[PDB]
Amino acid sequence: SDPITGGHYENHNGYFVYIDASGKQVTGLQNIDGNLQYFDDNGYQVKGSFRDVNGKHIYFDSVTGKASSNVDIVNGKAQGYDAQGNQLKKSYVADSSGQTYYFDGNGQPLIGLQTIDGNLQYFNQQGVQIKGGFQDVNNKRIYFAPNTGNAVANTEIINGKLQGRDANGNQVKNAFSKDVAGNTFYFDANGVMLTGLQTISGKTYYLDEQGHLRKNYAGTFNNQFMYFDADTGAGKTAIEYQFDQGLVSQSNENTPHNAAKSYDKSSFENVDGYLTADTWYRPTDILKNGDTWTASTETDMRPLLMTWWPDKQTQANYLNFMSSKGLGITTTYTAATSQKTLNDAAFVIQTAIEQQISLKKSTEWLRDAIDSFVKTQANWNKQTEDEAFDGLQWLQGGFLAYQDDSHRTPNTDSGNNRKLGRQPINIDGSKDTTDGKGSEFLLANDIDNSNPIVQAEQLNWLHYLMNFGSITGNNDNANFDGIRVDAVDNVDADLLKIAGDYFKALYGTDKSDANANKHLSILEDWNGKDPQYVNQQGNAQLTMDYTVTSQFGNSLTHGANNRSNMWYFLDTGYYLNGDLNKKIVDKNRPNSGTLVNRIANSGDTKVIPNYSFVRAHDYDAQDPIRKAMIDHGIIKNMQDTFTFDQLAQGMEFYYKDQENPSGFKKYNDYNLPSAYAMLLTNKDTVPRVYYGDMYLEGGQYMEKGTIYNPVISALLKARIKYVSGGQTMATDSSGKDLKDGETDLLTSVRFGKGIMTSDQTTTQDNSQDYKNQGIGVIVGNNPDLKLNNDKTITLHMGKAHKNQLYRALVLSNDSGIDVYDSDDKAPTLRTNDNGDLIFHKTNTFVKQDGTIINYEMKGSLNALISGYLGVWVPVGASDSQDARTVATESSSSNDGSVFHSNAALDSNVIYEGFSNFQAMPTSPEQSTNVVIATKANLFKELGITSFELAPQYRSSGDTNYGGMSFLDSFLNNGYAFTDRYDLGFNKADGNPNPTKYGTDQDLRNAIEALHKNGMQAIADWVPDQIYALPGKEVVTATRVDERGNQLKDTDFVNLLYVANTKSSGVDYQAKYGGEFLDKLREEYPSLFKQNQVSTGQPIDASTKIKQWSAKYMNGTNILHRGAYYVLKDWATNQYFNIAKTNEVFLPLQLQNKDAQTGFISDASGVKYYSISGYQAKDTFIEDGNGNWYYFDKDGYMVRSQQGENPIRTVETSVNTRNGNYYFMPNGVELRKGFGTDNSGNVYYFDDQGKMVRDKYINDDANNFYHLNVDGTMSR
């Protein structure tokens, strides 16, 4: 059947009905939103029963009522049916009880023993499949598997002894047989399971006390060591050396030809002196065309991997890969292949290479072949980087922290800076060991804001933005007024003080509220303990108030059906025993509740100044918009890259869902008008309004208003006219649960300019402004809310408004929300003697002149609401009425603080005026900042006092040097940028080069336009990171989580890595970097002398940052390059280098010396030489058959002696590998198995050979073992 959408589900008499978009009750088979359902003739939905439509016999599910497969006992005999209702042939079907039948070619179920797809199965006389049990079919007895039902070997206990049964149902005699768990046993001639050490068929196996065959198990069995095979469990003496490579010399007739022309940067492609897997070098001679050796010319570069390899495994892989590209006999080579053979094979490939270079007259084909091959190898890709997605790692796949390592990577040393996670609550590091350490790593290249030099540069940038117009256009009216601090908890909290003190010095923000409020500044500070920090520090920037944003989520904004009560908005716990009668403040609660109590807020108790919002560019936007794209198959993952066209298509579904007349929302938020009604009437907050609630989040800037625009616009204008004075808030509710009459409808009131209380009748200053001010707001979260006929709902407009006429601004109903622009067009209602507006289930209102109106207090459901909303204002409001308070020039407070929550601060409204998912401008005329200039007027009249612009920085775009791209970057929203000072300047050739938002002139025009209309402009200050730096350096890196803590089980610790950390040095960061600091030090010395908390030091302007590099970074997101992309010799663990001729280290082949490689015995023990010709000391080495060995400081393999403990404690240059290992007599390290010591104690050794302590360990056969603290196994 054809699908339908936009009809609600209703329940009558215990049954689901579905009412169409048409408004018609539905009968018959119906595909509703991709689910196939049925309704009988009364309109009820069928669940857990079969129905007959057309030729089909269709079952519907017992929970959902959705069409699915079942077996029906049609007439006498069972018959299978699919989801579409077709009788099934030659197919399995499971019925409602989870029982399985197989129906044959005629549709009739098979009974008895059967073979299906090579699987033996049994069926009872009713056709049902036996699963997970024995069964006596014929002479035999057969066990059948739990889920497949396939015949399998199993053991059962007959009498008191275990017995073995095979797959054919025959008992096992003189043989090995398994059980379902996975354990192997052996059963003798008499049928009885064997135990202990047993020799059968010339081989010895060890069976434990339980009779389990033990594989990969070491122990002294014959009073002599014995290792039991991983494959079959058969005992080897482990006396024979398993390495297959003797010491061999590699030098031959080609060595001097392929050796390096020079041991320096001329002849070797490199990074900071080091070599990489894809390094090309200049050989002394070149086998041109594969015929004749000729001296090389400077341009004749060849890949290092043509001639050298880190190990035989890599060499073999190189040979196999290049072979596959037509370069020689296609080969299966292994690390086990002899070194000589691999080298000979590499030369026939070299010959072939030189032939295709002559044939193509190009080397680009080879660059691509090498690049591709290199990425194949685990050590040269992300497989050795430990990609993880938990926590902030979710964004880009994981982080590396750079290290101070003056010996190997001195340019990258930070000078003992890089203090990580100095967020506000951990500004002094005193929570470094707990979760209270800040998540310093977020995105891209994380800047080291704990470094004084970098702190000074952030101030330079800050100055540049606050004087952007002066500096870039000599236009003193085109300057930003205030800032938003991006990612506060992901940076060193000193930046707050630096910014605060700058504003104090330059604008005297600590002097008056007028000064402070002229430079409105906000924080993106998510941590729940940030508000109290910010307030202790004097509120230099306004904290967000997540507690109210949160409660909107729970009670209104999130979820179609189940929501927290509106009661929770009150936070009655604020008062002792929620005594709303007694109102005694609770001096000592468990660090909980909403930031500002509004139950009876008369402005008498000091509160923390704040901004608050319902949504943001980065809250309830990014996830829904992507879930919508995922849901319609446009992308697969949240991290996945999408194109702008892909975004546009998804946006169409997002919009369809948002404006859905059904009233249901899958991705979008519910009750946004109702949420704004509360946000915009709340005392003691600077509300912020999200562009995307006013206009559509995609496409062009201001292209099309949202359905919420009228209501929010009305609320905003009404806020100018009526919102002042004290507040009260109550609910028809006392807690989680509602008594009989209770509605849980919230009533929020404001009184007028000087009126602070319910019972206050007049102002102290005898101003009359109050009489036509004030507002009443009623809101619910229940669309199915019906009042009792008894019930009355009251707005206590206050005793300053006795007998006054009030008129509606906004009233909800079943098709939308009506908006009333002026007193004449709206229904009036008059307050009583005590000043209460009384409401009933049914109301008859009269217009002041026009007519009589009917209205029910009814929860409604439509695109604009899921609940109730009523807003009422006093009639008689002047056209120019302004209830706002101007900020006072006087030094009102000696507290030292900048912002103060009061009527003046509350008179402000911030507009967050962009969306991250805007389309790119189709023309210069439609660029955001051009549009803002033409439309400035419109925001003045909505009461916006500060305009929060998007970050104006040039997007890093599609640029991607490694690792996962982020949406900020490819959507060009300005949060991901390469140059911090480029805000849309022209290309150097003179051509325009706008950001997503327009040119730099367009920005200055936009900012001026806002000042011409009395609004401020907010700059997005983004100090935490920078993207896509084009220059490479070699850092020392450790793999870390968001807090900069080393991952628990990582090998990636202090390794050399190639990162992209260096800026172009010829960009706007080079022009303007540090330039304004000297002028500033001269003019305000104390800024440069004042100590910061986290460092104990003042900012350092002695060094200017014209070019970024690794020393000023904490780290980066993993770049998918590999743990050992920077080439290293396994034997000595030293990295190759060619920077200075006095400290060169190269493989000996490349210097035309003789490189010997392999294992060689001597009277003392075994030694090993790497492919580069150096002896292994204090290092682990892996042979060509995959076995691992440790070579001690003296250069000798560690091996166990008879009668001595095989377990050895290893302390190596590579620290991560430290631990206790188990080395066998032939030096092989035991891995992923148990090992007995000389005294009979059992230990376990992990994937990498380390002993495991103090935990339970599980087995593939479901055996559990326990390891004590000292390592021993209690089991």
Ligand X SMILES: OC[C@H]1O[C@H](O[C@H]2[C@H](O)[C@@H](O)[C@@H](O)O[C@@H]2CO)[C@H](O)[C@@H](O)[C@@H]1O
Ligand Y SMILES: OC[C@H]1O[C@H](O)[C@H](O)[C@@H](O)[C@@H]1O
Are residues 720 and 759 in contact, defined by beta-carbon separation less than 8 angstroms? no
CB of 1262 to ligand X, least distance (A): 17
Tokens at residue 971, please? 């959507």
What are the C-alpha distances in Å from 808 to residues 556, 743, 746, 786? 22, 21, 17, 21
The binding site for its own copies (CB under 8 A) comprises 11-16, 47-49, 62-63, 75-76, 96-98, 112-113, 125, 136, 138-139, 145-148, 173-177, 182, 184, 189, 201-203, 229, 231-234, 320, 334-335, 377-378, 383, 387, 389-390, 394, 561-562, 636-638, 1260
Question: Which H or E element spans position 1189?
Answer: strand 1188-1191
The answer to whether 593 contacts ligand Y (rule: CB under 6 A) is yes
What are the C-alpha distances in Å from 403 to residues 409, 1139, 1177? 9, 21, 25
Nearer to its own copies, 115 or 1274 (CB): 115
Q: From its own copies, ligand Y, ligand X, none, which one binds at residue 568 (CB under 5 to 8 Å depending on kind)?
A: ligand Y
The answer to whether 573 contacts ligand Y (rule: CB under 6 A) is yes
CB of 636 to ligand X, least distance (A): 20
The answer to whether 94 contacts ligand X (rule: CB under 6 A) is yes
Residue from 45, 100, 758, 918 in contact with ligand X (CB under 6 A): 100
Q: From its own copies, ligand Y, Ca ion, none, which one binds at residue 554 (CB under 5 to 8 Å depending on kind)?
A: ligand Y
Q: From Ca ion, its own copies, ligand X, none, which one binds at residue 184 (CB under 5 to 8 Å depending on kind)?
A: its own copies
The answer to whether 190 contacts ligand Y (rule: CB under 6 A) is yes
| Helix spans in 689-742 (H) | 691-694, 709-722
The C-alpha angle 1163, 1164, 1168, rounded to 5 degrees, equals 100
Nearer to Ca ion, 82 or 446 (CB): 446
User: Which residue's CB atom is positioned nearest to ligand Y?
Assistant: 117
Q: What is the DSSP letter of 1028?
A: -
Among 58-66, 92-100, 709-717, 774-782, the segment contacting ligand X (CB under 6 A): 92-100
Are residues 1059 and 1050 in contact, defined by beta-carbon separation less than 8 angstroms? no
Residue from 554, 641, 662, 1097 in contact with ligand Y (CB under 6 A): 554
- Tell me the per-residue interface mask from 38 to 77 with ligand Y, x by CB under 6 A, - otherwise: ----------------------------------------
Nearer to ligand Y, 71 or 401 (CB): 71
Residue 552 CB partners (closer than 8 Å, separation 6+): 614, 675, 678, 679
Determine how many CB atoms are found less than 10 A away from the CB of residue 1046: 15
Within 268-421, strands assigned E span 280-281, 285-288, 292-295, 302-303, 399-402
What are the C-alpha distances in Å from 537 to residues 513, 516, 532, 570? 17, 15, 9, 28
Are residues 178 and 233 in contact, defined by beta-carbon separation less than 8 angstroms? no
Among 492-500, 590-598, 635-643, 777-785, the segment contacting ligand Y (CB under 6 A): 590-598
CB of 536 to ligand X, least distance (A): 57
Distance of CA 955 to the CA centre of its chain: 21
Query: Restricting to residues 135-164, which ones interact with ligand Y according to CB under 6 A?
Result: 147-148
Residue from 60, 333, 568, 1125 in contact with ligand Y (CB under 6 A): 568
Nearer to Ca ion, 930 or 1022 (CB): 1022
Binding-site positions for Ca(2+): 440, 446, 490, 1024
The answer to whether 92 contacts ligand Y (rule: CB under 6 A) is yes
- Tell me the per-residue interface mask from 957 to 986 with ligand Y, x by CB under 6 A, - otherwise: ------------------------------
Nearer to its own copies, 111 or 348 (CB): 111
What are the C-alpha distances in Å from 203 to residues 110, 200, 209? 45, 5, 19
The answer to whether 92 contacts ligand X (rule: CB under 6 A) is yes
Tokens at residue 458, please? 């952030």
Query: Burial code of 1178-1216, b = ≥16 C-beta within 10 A, e = fewer?
Result: bbbbbbbeebbbbbbeebbbbbbeeeeebbbebebeeeb
Nearer to ligand X, 107 or 429 (CB): 107
Q: From its own copies, ligand Y, Ca ion, none, which one binds at residue 157 (CB under 5 to 8 Å depending on kind)?
A: none
> What 3-state class would DSSP assign to 756?
coil
Binding-site positions: 440, 446, 490, 1024
Q: From its own copies, ligand Y, Ca ion, none, which one binds at residue 490 (CB under 5 to 8 Å depending on kind)?
A: Ca ion
Query: Restricting to residues 1099-1138, which ones interact with ligand X according to CB under 6 A?
Result: none
The answer to whether 103 contacts ligand Y (rule: CB under 6 A) is no
> Would residue 361 be called left, alpha or beta, if left means φ above 0 and alpha means ψ between -120 and 50 degrees?
left
Residue from 117, 390, 1162, 1260 in contact with ligand Y (CB under 6 A): 117
Query: Burial code of 732-758, b = ≥16 C-beta within 10 A, e = fewer?
Result: bbeeeeeeeebbbbbbbbbbbbbbbbb
Distance CA 689, CA 716 (A): 10
Q: From ligand X, its own copies, ligand Y, none, which one binds at residue 573 (CB under 5 to 8 Å depending on kind)?
A: ligand Y
205 bridge partner residues: 198, 234
Q: From ligand Y, Ca ion, its own copies, none, which one binds at residue 208 (CB under 5 to 8 Å depending on kind)?
A: none
The answer to whether 129 contacts ligand X (rule: CB under 6 A) is yes
Are residues 819 and 810 in contact, defined by beta-carbon separation less than 8 angstroms? yes
CB of 556 to ligand Y, least distance (A): 10
Could you give the dihedral angle defined by the CA atoms of residues 834, 836, 840 and 842, in that order, rounded to the nearest 10 degrees? 110
The binding site for Ca ion (CB under 5 A) comprises 440, 446, 490-491, 1024
Q: From ligand Y, its own copies, ligand X, none, which one binds at residue 196 (CB under 5 to 8 Å depending on kind)?
A: none
CB of 892 to its own copies, least distance (A): 48
Q: What is the DSSP letter of 4?
A: B
Nearer to ligand X, 66 or 131 (CB): 131
Which residues in the chain are immediately followed by a break of C to N over 2.5 Å? none
Q: From its own copies, ligand X, Ca ion, none, which one binds at residue 246 (CB under 5 to 8 Å depending on kind)?
A: none
Among 544-552, 740-748, 1125-1133, 1172-1180, the segment contacting ligand Y (CB under 6 A): 544-552
Tokens at residue 575, please? 């008062």
Q: From its own copies, ligand Y, ligand X, none, which one binds at residue 1160 (CB under 5 to 8 Å depending on kind)?
A: none
Distance CA 9, CA 1086 (A): 68
CB of 94 to ligand Y, least distance (A): 4
The C-alpha angle 1191, 1195, 1197, rounded to 5 degrees, equals 40
Tokens at residue 424, please? 């506000």
| Helix spans in 451-528 (H) | 452-466, 468-473, 494-507, 513-517
Q: What single-letter amino acid sits at 1034?
A: V
> What 3-state class would DSSP assign to 10?
strand
CB of 788 to ligand Y, least distance (A): 26
CB of 549 to its own copies, least distance (A): 21
Q: Taking Cα atoms as reference points, which of 784, 776, 782 lies closest to residue 811?
A: 776
Nearer to its own copies, 416 or 637 (CB): 637
Distance CA 1243, CA 1275 (A): 10
CB of 100 to ligand X, least distance (A): 3
Among 92-100, 341-349, 502-510, 692-700, the segment contacting ligand Y (CB under 6 A): 92-100
Size (the chain), residues: 1275
Radius of gyration of the chain (CA): 38
Among 587-595, 1015-1023, 1166-1174, 1234-1242, the segment contacting ligand Y (CB under 6 A): 587-595
Nearer to ligand Y, 96 or 224 (CB): 96
1055 bridge partner residues: 1037
Q: Which positions touch ligand Y (CB under 6 A)?
A: 92, 94, 98, 100, 116-117, 147-148, 190-191, 547, 550-551, 554, 564, 568-569, 571, 573, 592-594
Q: Which positions touch ligand X (CB under 6 A)?
A: 92, 94, 98, 100, 129, 148-149
